[PDB]
Amino acid sequence: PHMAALRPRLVFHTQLAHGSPTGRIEGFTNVKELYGKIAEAFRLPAAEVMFCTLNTHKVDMDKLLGGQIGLEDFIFAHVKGQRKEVEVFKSEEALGLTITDNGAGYAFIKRIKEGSVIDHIQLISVGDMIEAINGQSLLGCRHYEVARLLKELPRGRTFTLKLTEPRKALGTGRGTLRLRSRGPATVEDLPSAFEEKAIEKVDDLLESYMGIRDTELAATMVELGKDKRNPDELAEALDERLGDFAFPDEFVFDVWGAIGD
Amino acid sequence: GPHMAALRPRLVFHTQLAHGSPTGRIEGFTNVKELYGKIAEAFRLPAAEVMFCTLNTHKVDMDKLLGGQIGLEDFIFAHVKGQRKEVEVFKSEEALGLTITDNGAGYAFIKRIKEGSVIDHIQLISVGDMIEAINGQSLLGCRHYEVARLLKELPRGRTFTLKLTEPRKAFGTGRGTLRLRSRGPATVEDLPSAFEEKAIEKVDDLLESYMGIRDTELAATMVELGKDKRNPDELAEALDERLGDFAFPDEFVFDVWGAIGD
């Protein structure tokens, strides 16, 4: 699934910073339309909206809207698939299994240690839920109960597992709505730790050089310059939209170093 | 109002079956059982068909397995035009000490003021104030860098007047999350701090070494049970109340106590 196909509507909640009940808004592709929607929700002229802060009603510039509005977690449900029954020979006291459960009566395999006797059996995977051990049914049992039975299996013998596989077709992967200054909004991944730091550096340069801050613009420049391979490619790119800023080439060089490894 | 309890009337989440489905919308669950039921309902399945949930990936990724938390979207607070001010200032040789931003739609406003600056020593000017005019000339529709430049280039020694509008004011990121407790209520909370996430991971490690299991939600529960506890005995007492069915050894309880500290 491509991220933008997941939600038909991106609905957000909003309040006036000085105090109001919550309104719900949706259907905007830039900040002007965002402001429009909020004003509409509260029976205000659109001209009255100054700026937005995220997750605080205080005038907190650290939390000023700056090109990103985060989304809620998307929930993927794994349902029952192929049922298996696998015979395993306990040849080591430790089989290599870490058991969890779904907090509702199903226990399943969360970790398989590489090298372990379990790892050497190909027919068992992470995610497989354990339905029975040696014919003893385990639906309704907690992970620790299942874990215990596993530990106490006779170390000289072959045991059987009844398993159900779920059907199958860094960061957390949580989505964000990226409000771009130079075009329509997009759904993106969250910026990496590296990118956030590079964004702060560029925002610092915007201040020291131009007497401004703009996290959205900073992010735009970071995204823009990443597959540029020299300050000249970068400078060409800055000029493609941002001529009026009249970036001194020292700024370009500075930005160029700011967005690197 | 901005009280955590008064933010959202309902918490709606989107869901797909991990092997491929259209998107469904669910609401109303107060535990995992009820969550699995609402998901099964949405896709017309028996509730017993749902095995487990992963967050933000369809893959069997245990790092992203549901573990007691379902994060919410950002809450948007709109600041609107309030009190109007006119402020006269002498332009000197030195920089005013002002950092300008804008709302990306034609309003420039003050994001920072340097301590000790010309501007800082004029308490009539505040962070958040938008600049509507300089010397009567409207700046509505100007960009931040243009306002910054005008302020920079103001003739030395001459007074200038700022027409300003304050936003109306009330008398981590702060983004919310739904905490799905196994031994308590489902509530909207703040995100765990970096310390708490690390403590949780450390407790999860202990669950594996002592019991051969992992259970991130149970780890979160233990970390939350122990946060306000003065000593291991107090921890051991809370664990017995909420988690007495587990029957934890005392060395585990002591080891957990260490997990949740510096």
* Rounded-to-integer distance, Cα B84 and Cα B99, Å: 20
Resolution, given in Å to one decimal, reads 1.9
Instruction: Tell whether A50 lies on the interface with B, counting CB pairs under 8 A.
Output: yes
Q: Is A248 helix (H, G, I), strand (E, B) or coil?
A: coil
Token representation of residue A128: 């497989």
Q: 3-state DSSP call for residue A247? A: coil
Verify whether the Cβ–Cβ distance A61 to B7 is below 8 Å: no
Q: Characterize the bridge pairing of strands B76-90 and A12-16.
A: parallel
Radius of gyration, CA atoms only, chain A: 27
Residue A113 in contact with partner chain B when CB distance is under 8 A: no
Residue length, chain A? 261
Query: Chain B contact for A21, CB < 8 A?
Result: yes
- At residue B145, the 3 state secondary structure works out as helix
Do residue A167 and residue B1 have CB atoms under 8 angstroms apart? Answer: no
Task: Determine, for residues B76 and A19 on separate chains, whether the beta-carbon distance falls below 8 Å.
Answer: no
Percentages helix, strand, coil for chain A (3-state, rounded to 5) are 35, 25, 40
DSSP class of residue A46 equals: G
Judge: A54–B98 Cβ closer than 8 Å, yes or no. no
Whether B98 and B151 have beta carbons less than 8 Å apart is answered as yes
> Partners of B134 in the beta sheet?
B137, B162
Contact A207 B19 (CB under 8 A): no
Question: Which residue of A29, A31, A79 is the best one to mutate when testing the B interface, meaning the one whose CB has the most B CBs within 10 A?
Answer: A79
DSSP reduced 3-state for A76: strand
Kindly state the helix (H) or strand (E) to which residue B195 belongs, with its residue range.
helix B194-211
Distance CA A72, CA A83 (A): 33
Instruction: Say how far residue B190 (Cα) sits from the centre of its chain.
Output: 6
Beta-carbon-side half-sphere exposure of residue B225 (alpha carbons within 13 Å): 28
User: CB B175 to CB A70 under 8 A?
Assistant: yes
Sort out which chain A residues have CB atoms less than 8 A from B176's CB and list them: 55
Chain A interface mutation, best of B11, B15, B23, B56, highest count of A Cβ atoms under 10 Å: B56
Chain-chain contact of B100 with A212 (C-beta, under 8 angstroms): yes
Q: How far is A182 from chain B (nearest CA, A)?
A: 10
CA distances for A90 relative to A59, A121, A123, A134, A153, angstroms: 63, 11, 15, 13, 8
Would you give the DSSP letter of residue B262?
-
Which residues 157-216 of A have a C-beta within 8 angstroms of B? Answer: 164, 166-170, 172-175, 179, 181, 207, 210-214, 216
With b for 16 or more beta-carbon neighbours within 10 A and e for fewer, the A206-224 pattern comes to bbebbbbbbbbbbbbbbbb
Q: What gap in Å lies between CA A258 and CA A54, rounded to an integer? A: 26
Touching A: B residues 57-86, CB under 8 Å: 57-58, 60, 62-66, 70-82
Residue type, B4: M
Q: How far apart are the first and last CA of chain A?
A: 31
How many residue pairs bridge chain A and chain B with CB atoms within 8 Å of each other? 343
Closest CB to B80 among A50, A126, A129 = A50
Tokens representing residue B130 in the block: 């938008």
- The CATH code belonging to domain A80-166 is 2.30.42.10
Of A4, A5, A12, residue with least CA distance to A65: A12
Fold topology of B81-167: Pdz3 Domain (2.30.42)
Do the Cβ atoms of B39 and A6 come within 8 Å? no
Residues 6+ apart with CB under 8 A from B129: B85, B109, B110, B164, B165, B166, B167
Shortest CA distance from B42: residue in chain A: A77
Residues in chain B: 262
Residue-by-residue DSSP string for A141-167: --HHHHHHHHHTS-TTSEEEEEEEEEP
Nearest CB partner across the interface for A31, out of B33, B72, B104:
B104
Q: What angle do CA A178, A182, A185 make, to 5 degrees?
A: 30
| Encoded tokens for B94 | 């030195």
Phi, psi of B229 (to 5 degrees): -85, 135
Give the whole-angstrom CA distance, residue A31 versus residue A179: 7
Q: Which of A57, A71, A75 sits opposite B2 (nearest CB)?
A: A57
- Give yes or no for a contact between A117 and A96, defined as CB atoms under 8 angstroms apart: yes
Test B100 with A168 for CB contact under 8 angstroms.
no
Half-sphere exposure of B158 (CA within 13 A, CB side): 9
Cα angle vertex A34, ends A33, A39, to 5°? 95
Pairwise CA distance, residues A162 & A149, whole Å: 14
Helical segments of chain A, H only? 31-41, 117-120, 143-151, 193-210, 215-225, 231-242, 249-258
Spatial separation of the C-alpha atoms in residues B103 and A28, rounded to whole Å: 15
Strands (E), B95-172: 98-102, 108-113, 130-134, 137-138, 159-167
d(CA A117, CA A90): 7
**What's the token pair of residue B54?**
């992963």
Backbone angles phi, psi at A154, to 5 degrees: -65, 125
A23–B contact, CB cutoff 8 A: no
Q: Produce one character per residue of B188-220: b if its CB has 16 or more CB atoms within 10 Å, e if not.
A: eeebbeeeeeebbebbbebbbeebbbbbbbbbb
Q: Where are the alpha helices (DSSP H) in A52-125?
A: 117-120
Q: Do A150 and B17 touch (CB under 8 A)?
A: no
CA distance A214 to B4: 29
**Interface contact A103-B32, CB threshold 8 A:** yes
